[PDB]
Amino acid sequence: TNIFEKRINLKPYEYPELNEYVAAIRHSYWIHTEFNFTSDIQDFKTGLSEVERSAIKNTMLAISQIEVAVKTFWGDVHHRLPKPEIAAVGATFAESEVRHHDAYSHLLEILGLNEEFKELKKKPVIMKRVHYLETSLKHAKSDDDREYTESILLFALFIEHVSLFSQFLIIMAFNKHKNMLKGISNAVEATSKEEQIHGDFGVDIINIIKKENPEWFDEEHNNLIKEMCLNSFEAESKVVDWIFEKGELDFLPKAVINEFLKNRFNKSLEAIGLEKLFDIDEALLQETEWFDDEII
Amino acid sequence: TNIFEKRINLKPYEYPELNEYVAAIRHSYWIHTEFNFTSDIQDFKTGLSEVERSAIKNTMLAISQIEVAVKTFWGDVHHRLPKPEIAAVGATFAESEVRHHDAYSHLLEILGLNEEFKELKKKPVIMKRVHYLETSLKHAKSDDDREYTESILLFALFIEHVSLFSQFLIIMAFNKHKNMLKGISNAVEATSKEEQIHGDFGVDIINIIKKENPEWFDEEHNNLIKEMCLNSFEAESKVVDWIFEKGELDFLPKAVINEFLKNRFNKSLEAIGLEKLFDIDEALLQETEWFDDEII
Ligand SMILES: [Mn+2]
Ligand SMILES: [Mn+2]
Ligand SMILES: [Mn+2]
Ligand SMILES: [Mn+2]
């Protein structure tokens, strides 16, 4: 098998196991119109202290920075990985991103955050985030399979599996602790599950590429993956600092969120056979174990 | 205002009305696992005469010739029509085609038609159908916007709005008259509604292209569209002859199916401002009015 080459017959599948990702998204499928956000609008308006409102506002803006955008990467994977089973997953994933866009676009509207969203791009922390996101996808349109592989790798391991996860954690933790933001936490939980599925497929694709082209993955390029991992963590850790610019939440300190992120980065590296990059404080990490127990 | 030109900023939308197509497919969304085909399997095995079974088998094979294939045209429209609103529709449509593929692939399996499906491509009537289908999409990957426009036009007006519709009509008519093939007619009705939506969006895209580039739609190019309309009808009319090779169904004669097809071809031409091509026998057309009353 060669993942990069087109095949003559539709059947049999060369990577039949990838078909499970279509079933996974059909099971996770959701539209924001299934949730009721009336209490969330009221909570955001009058139920929060100024510290809590600033944290929630910034978290919603940070999710939207990624979700409220044109996201065609998954829908285009078939051009460079021309397999029917990959094209099926890619199309299923591309549609799920349209559902995410509509959900967060609706949430910015009803929370009265459209003007703040338009001005978000001017923030240095956001520009720094955009830099690592654009660098990660610099080869998304490359004619070289090895360069394109770098884009899949960084996109799946770090963007899909980690970029939004401090934000998903903040919303879920807020609902778990305060029983507020019911509709938003439902939408966030549904988005988390789909991003987890997106990254898992990308991890599987990378392991197929690595199995078929082991010589592309030397100690040298493994060091290049590790420095991109560090850049992603530093940028996301700074986004966390900005989210809590008006004060930390006592039940979810930044130190707890940072350990949660480092662990996700480690798991992404380990998923493709690399060694872990971050030393983990187990006691601080334990505080967020409930998140993965919910997402699965 | 140019449909072919990239707009990086998400809002304001240039064609906000195209968003209705994403909501239309979310409303029509279905998976074959929502239907029960147990009675259909039994009907196909023991409930049909030799004439009826041959007609149903050939109809299912003809639907599958189009549906059981990699269908990435809709998911790629954004490359040449780089608008966020178009990209959202394209991704939603590309996913619906994966659902259609899984549905008809499941139906070929449970009806024991996998081997007959593998050999279908060798039939002269099928080769003749493939010829007009491939000719219609010959410019699907062109760098010239005018040539690409020809592919969208033929694909939407004739392939999406008509190619499968004699088959959808045959299945629904069989269920209406005989109260058999319950699950299959449900899946066919659900597919018909989504193909109707697919072609409607394509018609809207063509009318935007025609509004922005009226000089592209000259008498010479309109004559080519009419010549392609005739080629599509002749090939689909021959597919109908093949479906009924073992005998016609008294309740749905070929003359009735052919008038149904000619009328659909006329409506596609009229939808983009071209004149009707076929003379219609109104009495024979009236016999299939119930079909559009169900789909629309
Ligand atoms: Mn998303
Ligand atoms: Mn994703
Ligand atoms: Mn279809
Ligand atoms: Mn279609």
Numbering used by the authors:
A (entry chain B), B (entry chain A): 104 to 399
From the paper:
Ribonucleotide reductase (RNR) is the only enzyme capable of de novo synthesis of deoxyribonucleotides (dNTPs). Class I RNRs consist of a substrate-binding component (NrdA or α) and a radical-generating component (NrdB or β). Conversely, class Id RNRs from Facklamia ignava, Leeuwenhoekiella blandensis and Flavobacterium johnsoniae are all proposed to function without an organic radical, and instead utilize a mixed valent Mn2(IV,III) metal centre. Here, we crystallized and solved the structures of an N-terminally truncated form of LbNrdB lacking the ATP-cone domain, LbNrdBΔ99, in two forms: apo and aerobically Mn2+ loaded.
Aerobically Mn2+-reconstituted LbNrdB∆99 crystallized in space group P212121 with one dimer in the asymmetric unit. The Mn2+ ions are 3.9 Å from each other. One manganese ion (Mn1) is heptacoordinate, having a bidentate interaction with Glu170 and monodentate interactions to Glu200, Glu298, His203 and a water molecule. The other manganese ion (Mn2) is pentacoordinate, with a bidentate interaction to Glu263 and monodentate interactions to Glu200, Glu298, His301 and a loosely bound water molecule (2.6 Å). As previously seen, a conserved lysine residue, Lys174, is projected inwards from an unusual loop that bisects helix B, and its side chain is held in place by a network of H-bonds to the carbonyl oxygen atoms of Glu170 and Glu200, as well as the Mn2+-coordinating side chains of the same residues. In the metal-loaded state, helix B is divided into two parts by an unusual central loop that projects Lys174 towards the metal site. However triggered, the conformational changes clearly open up a channel from the surface of the protein that leads to the Mn site, which has previously been proposed to be important for the diffusion of superoxide. The crystal structure of the highly homologous NrdB protein from L. blandensis reveals a fully occupied dimeric manganese metal centre with Tyr207 (corresponding to F. ignava Tyr276 that aligns with the radical-containing tyrosine residue in RNRs from subclasses Ia and Ib) positioned with its −OH group at a distance of 7.6 Å from Mn1 in the metal site, locked in that position by an H-bond to the conserved Thr294 (Thr363 in F. ignava NrdB).
